[PDB]
Amino acid sequence: SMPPVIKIDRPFHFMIYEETSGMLLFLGRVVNPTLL
Amino acid sequence: SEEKASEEEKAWLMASRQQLAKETSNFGFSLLRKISMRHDGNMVFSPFGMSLAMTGLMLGATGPTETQIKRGLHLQALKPPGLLPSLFKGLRETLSRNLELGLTQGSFAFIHKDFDVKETFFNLSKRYFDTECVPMNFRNASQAKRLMNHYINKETRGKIPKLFDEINPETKLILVDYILFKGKWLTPFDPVFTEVDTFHLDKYKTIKVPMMYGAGKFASTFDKNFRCHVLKLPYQGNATMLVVLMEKMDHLALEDYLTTDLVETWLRNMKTRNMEVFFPKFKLDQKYEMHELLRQMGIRRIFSPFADLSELSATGRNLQVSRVLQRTVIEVDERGTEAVAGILSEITA
């Protein structure tokens, strides 16, 4: 009776996949989103 | 009959393509591991594009030069010929079938004055990567820089305006591969709900960042071993972003345990539920000299005085790769994601 909440409020890893082939197009870590 | 020989072959192609996807992911995770040893902080790169770049080199090498590249990419053998073209044809098809994907890739060969390339390598590069050849004068370094940066700026649509910084005058050939991904979220975030929020840099420090907000059906799971949430943020065209969030501030560094099996385990344990998601906007721009890193992955001889690139050039002997540079830029947004990677390989005399 209270939906889950996921808050990406700390360093995280990301992966962009093309799901048909299964190819990992991009792979990364974000440790601070306010800068390059 | 006629089906028997082709039906067995389709099973084999299907198997081989799964094997290639798996190997490219693991190649990626190996790199992430190597890269992280020198660079703390934000990082981004393209495993797919990096391995296309290297297979471009590989076809061109022979002997220990070639076989070292196959090992580095995790390119293990397959069953029993001459069916490598069919494997690449199959990959293009799969990456072309869905018109909403928003993925384009391409390839350049920048060539030095009168440095004649072997015919079979030229052909293959067009057949496998649609490589475009452009004559060049690397002796006239400042001029070649401007001309090559124009070509990459065009194709990357303004997002990597200056891939090249310095030009080695002894350069005989440089191969650039690029990949462009324009993903739109399957359900975009409504920018009316983007708010400033607290991000935790570490256990003590924090910073304020724009957080995008969505509420609805999302697929996720919780790995109890690594103590992390994994979340799917789907794109149009059958692509997706996996996000892995550790619950505690590094502790068990995921980098060092990350494999195709771990990811497959997560994808198997996903469940879909109504939930609320806060997710920050970000731009990244990263640049990595792969030379020394690839050397650590066992790809040695391509960079040594004894490099054997005799399938790239008939006569030319004193050839070697001097630099492999990779530049990647990503922008995550309320509308989606836009990611560009450019990868260049300096072949020198």
- What does B148-185 look like in DSSP terms, one character per residue? HHHHHHHHTTTS-S-------TTEEEEEEEEEEEEEEB
Q: B186-280 falls under which CATH superfamily?
A: Alpha-1-antitrypsin, domain 1 (2.30.39.10)
Residues of A with a Cβ under 8 Å from any B Cβ are 3-36
Query: Beta-carbon neighbour count of residue B198 at 10 Å?
Result: 12
CB-nearest to A17 from B44, B239, B277 is B239
B70: its two tokens? 């196959």
Smallest CA–CA distance, residue B303 to chain A, in Å, is 26
Instruction: Find where tokens 């124009």 sit.
Output: B150
Q: Distance between CA B18 and CA B12 in Å, rounded?
A: 10
**For B199, nearest residue in chain A (alpha carbons):** A9
Task: Give the angle subtended at the CA of B194 by the CAs of B192 and B195, to the nearest 5°.
Answer: 120
Residues 6+ apart with CB under 8 A from B2: none
CB-nearest to A36 from B18, B200, B284 is B284
Pairing type for strands B228-234 and A5-7 reads unpaired
Say if the Cβ atoms of A30 and B181 lie within 8 Å.
Answer: no
B55: its two tokens? 């297979």
| Burial class for B210, CB neighbours closer than 10 Å (0-12, 13-18, 19+) | middle
Q: Distance between CA B108 and CA B148 in Å, rounded?
A: 10
Say if the Cβ atoms of A10 and B249 lie within 8 Å.
Answer: yes
**Which residues of chain A neighbour B25 with C-beta distances below 8 Å?**
22-24
Smallest CA–CA distance, residue B116 to chain A, in Å, is 33
Smallest CA–CA distance, residue B44 to chain A, in Å, is 4
**Cα dihedral B70→B71→B75→B77 (10° resolution):** 90
Three-state DSSP class for B240?
strand
Where does CATH 2.30.39.10 sit in chain B? 186-280
Are B325 and B288 contacting, i.e. CB atoms less than 8 angstroms apart? yes
Are B130 and B163 contacting, i.e. CB atoms less than 8 angstroms apart? no
For chain A, the first-to-last Cα distance in angstroms comes to 40
Question: What resolution in Å is listed for this PDB structure?
Answer: 2.7
Q: Which residues pair with B131 in a beta bridge?
A: B107
Mutate which: A5, A9, A25, vs B, most B CBs within 10 A: A25
Q: Tell me which residue of A24, A18, A31 sits closest to B52, measured CA to CA.
A: A24
- Interhelix angle for B119-129 vs B47-58, to 10°? 160
Helix or strand (DSSP H, E) at B282: strand B282-289
Rg (CA), chain B: 22
Alpha carbon separation from B339 to B115, B243, B290 (Å, rounded): 34, 16, 19
A5: its two tokens? 């909440």
Q: Distance between CA B216 and CA B277 in Å, rounded?
A: 8
Say if the Cβ atoms of B254 and A13 lie within 8 Å.
Answer: yes
- Interhelix angle for B2-38 vs B84-96, to 10°? 80
Q: Which residues pair with B337 in a beta bridge?
A: B183, B332
Say if the Cβ atoms of A6 and B42 lie within 8 Å.
Answer: no
Q: Distance between CA B60 and CA B58 in Å, rounded?
A: 5
Alpha carbon separation from B136 to A26, B115, B139, B288 (Å, rounded): 31, 10, 9, 24
Q: Distance between CA B342 and CA B201 in Å, rounded?
A: 29
**Which residues of chain A neighbour B42 with C-beta distances below 8 Å?**
28-32, 35-36
**Which residues of chain A neighbour B285 with C-beta distances below 8 Å?**
36
The CATH number, out of the four listed (3.20.20.70, 1.10.1740.10, 3.90.950.20, 3.30.497.10), of the domain defined by the range B1-185+281-349 = 3.30.497.10
B54: its two tokens? 């290297």
Q: Distance between CA B115 and CA B103 in Å, rounded?
A: 33
The CATH number, out of the four listed (2.10.310.10, 3.40.720.10, 1.10.287.470, 3.30.1330.20), of the domain defined by the range A1-36 = 2.10.310.10
Residue boundaries of the structural domains of chain A? 1-36
**For A4, nearest residue in chain B (alpha carbons):** B275
B172: its two tokens? 């005989």
Question: Can you give B20-45 as a three-state secondary structure string?
Answer: HHHHHHHHHHHHHHHHHHHCCCCEEE
For residue A11, the Cα-to-chain-centroid distance in whole angstroms is: 10
CB-nearest to B41 from A18, A25, A31 is A31
**For B276, nearest residue in chain A (alpha carbons):** A5
Where does CATH 3.30.497.10 sit in chain B? 1-185+281-349
Smallest CA–CA distance, residue A2 to chain B, in Å, is 9
Are B181 and A26 contacting, i.e. CB atoms less than 8 angstroms apart? yes
Three-state DSSP class for B133?
strand
Smallest CA–CA distance, residue A26 to chain B, in Å, is 4
Identify residues after which chain B is interrupted (C–N over 2.5 A). 80, 249
Q: Distance between CA A29 and CA B40 in Å, rounded?
A: 10
Q: Distance between CA B161 and CA B164 in Å, rounded?
A: 9
Say if the Cβ atoms of B278 and A13 lie within 8 Å.
Answer: no
Residues 6+ apart with CB under 8 A from B44: A26, A27, A28, A29, B284, B286, B328, B329, B330, B339
